[PDB]
């Protein structure tokens, strides 16, 4: 795609994760499962909700138009009415349709951008304490506890606590 | 102990806020307003040409020549005409001025 996250280096989505939009999945001998990211998913949902709300708000202005009766000698006024109403219909239809297309485009782009941002955050927190694969998955060099797992989920991962540990465990 | 460098962005005491499809009422650094709502509540000239006023009459009594609207008279010129709503000096002898709306439209030009 554009950011390469959705349908890119992360090919398939997780049919199991129903706790949020973007999230992690961890599986070790201590436990396995998916877990959504609260802040990123909530921020994306807030952005989408505000987008939809503004789209419906700025479109609530109704263009009222009724076809009055026009006589035999009112062909010109009738044609003027028809042309005006048809032009307004064409303008509104074009505007709505192209707005829908462009908004879906940039919305999907925002989604995959959020995915890539989460992945790059996890990358920046694990500079050399973990290896990276071509599927958006990180392989810790030193085995992390579930508490370290949350410390990565919340973003409070402590680097000097595991620096020497990963530096020793990384070669073997 | 060690050297350092950072990459940042400009920030200031700006409290002007803008809106956006995603977030609204967000304080921005520099915002430019495109709408103008403040006006001088009066009537000025256009191309330095003086407008026209009745102040007690209508256009009907003006071009017909009601004796109480004779301040407008002779050779005159303008750019736009102002008609007051509560005027009372219009058609004195009762009757119908045919195509009065078209007359007003043609006079405006």
């Amino acid at each position: 795609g554009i950011f390469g996250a959705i349908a890119g280096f992360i090919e398939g989505g997780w049919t199991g994760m129903i706790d949020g939009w973007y999230g992690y999945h961890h599986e070790n001998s201590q436990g396995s499962g998916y877990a959504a990211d609260r802040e990123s998913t909530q921020k994306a949902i807030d952005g989408i909700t505000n987008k939809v709300n503004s789209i419906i708000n700025k479109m609530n202005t109704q263009f009222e138009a009724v076809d009055h009766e026009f006589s035999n000698l009112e062909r010109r006024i009738g044609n003027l009415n028809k042309r005006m109403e048809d032009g307004f219909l064409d303008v509104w239809t074009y505007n709505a349709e192209l707005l829908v297309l462009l908004e879906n485009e940039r919305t999907l782009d925002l989604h995959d951008a959020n995915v890539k941002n989460l992945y790059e955050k996890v990358k920046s927190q694990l500079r050399d304490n973990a290896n990276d694969l071509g599927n958006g998955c990180f392989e810790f060099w030193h085995k992390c506890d579930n508490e370290c797992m949350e410390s990565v989920k919340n973003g409070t991962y402590d680097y000097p606590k595991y620096q020497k540990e990963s530096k020793l465990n990384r070669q073997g | 102990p060690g050297d350092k460098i950072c990459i940042g962005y400009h920030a200031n005491n700006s409290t002007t806020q803008v809106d956006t499809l995603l977030e609204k009422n967000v304080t921005v650094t520099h915002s430019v307003e495109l709408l103008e709502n403040q006006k001088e509540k009066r009537f000025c000239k256009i191309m330095n040409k003086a407008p026209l006023d009745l102040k007690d009459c209508t256009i009907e009594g003006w071009i017909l020549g009601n004796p109480k609207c004779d301040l407008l008279l002779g050779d005159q010129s303008w750019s736009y005409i102002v008609e007051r709503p509560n005027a009372q000096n219009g058609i004195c002898y009762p009757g119908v001025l045919n195509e009065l709306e078209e007359l007003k439209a043609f006079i405006g030009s």
Partner: antibody, heavy 130, light 109 residues
């Protein structure tokens, strides 16, 4: 507004146990997380209880943490609550109401909505004294 | 719990403002929301997601959220706003909702 009704309101005696409830209608209800809030007579509010669309997250208040127990029947579309250890310190009105909560309390299908259920059902007064 | 100013005042057409302060547990982390209790009535939803007006489409109401603080604003403030007002957050440290309990107002009568 939408269809709402309550059950259990009135004047209950102290020291006993209370069992209140409220049922709404107008459209689907089995897919939204509902709220229970308090209002001291005169001035003051304080949130009380939360409930998911299914009932996984309980997440009671601080003042009544583990003291009450809420429940909902999504096949009957009703939201009830049972609580013991009642005193005059809780004499107040209470509302069953949908308030803006984090996304996970709402269903997987209703995470985005144009009008996010600005509903706030009516009040139910409880007054305990001699 | 939460913090909430006692009262508020303003002439009709003076854009009354009300604040709502919290901490990193409730306001700094998650979004805030607003509520309006008319005298003796079951109240209604004012603003969700810190800026959005619901399908009740109230236009004169404005919401803002900046870090540890939130703000509600009313332009015009006609007589239909004589009511209790309330601010609320999520308190991510705990689970359930948190409320700033009680702020009323008065207009220039």
């Amino acid at each position: 507004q939408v269809q709402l009704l309550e059950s259990g309101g009135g004047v209950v005696q102290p020291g006993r146990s209370l069992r209140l409830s409220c049922a709404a209608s107008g459209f689907t209800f089995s897919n939204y997380g509902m709220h229970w809030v308090r209002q001291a007579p005169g001035k003051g509010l304080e949130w009380v209880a939360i409930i998911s669309f299914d009932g996984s997250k309980k997440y009671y208040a601080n003042s009544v943490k583990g003291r009450s127990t809420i429940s909902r029947d999504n096949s009957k579309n009703t939201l009830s609550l049972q609580m013991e250890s009642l005193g005059p310190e809780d004499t107040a009105l209470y509302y069953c109401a949908k308030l803006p909560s984090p996304y996970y309390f709402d269903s997987r299908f209703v995470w985005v909505a144009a009008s996010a259920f600005h509903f706030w059902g009516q009040g139910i007064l409880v007054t305990v004294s001699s | 719990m939460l913090t909430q100013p006692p009262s508020a005042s303003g002439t009709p057409g003076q854009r009354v403002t009300i604040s709502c302060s919290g901490s990193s547990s409730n306001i700094g982390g998650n979004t805030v929301h607003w509520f309006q209790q008319l005298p003796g009535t079951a109240p209604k939803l004012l603003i969700y997601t810190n800026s959005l007006r619901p399908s009740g489409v109230p236009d004169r109401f404005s919401g803002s959220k900046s870090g540890t603080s939130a703000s509600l604003a009313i332009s015009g403030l006609q007589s239909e706003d004589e009511a209790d007002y309330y601010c609320a957050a999520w308190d991510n440290s705990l689970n359930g909702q948190v409320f700033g309990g009680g702020t009323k107002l008065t207009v220039l009568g």
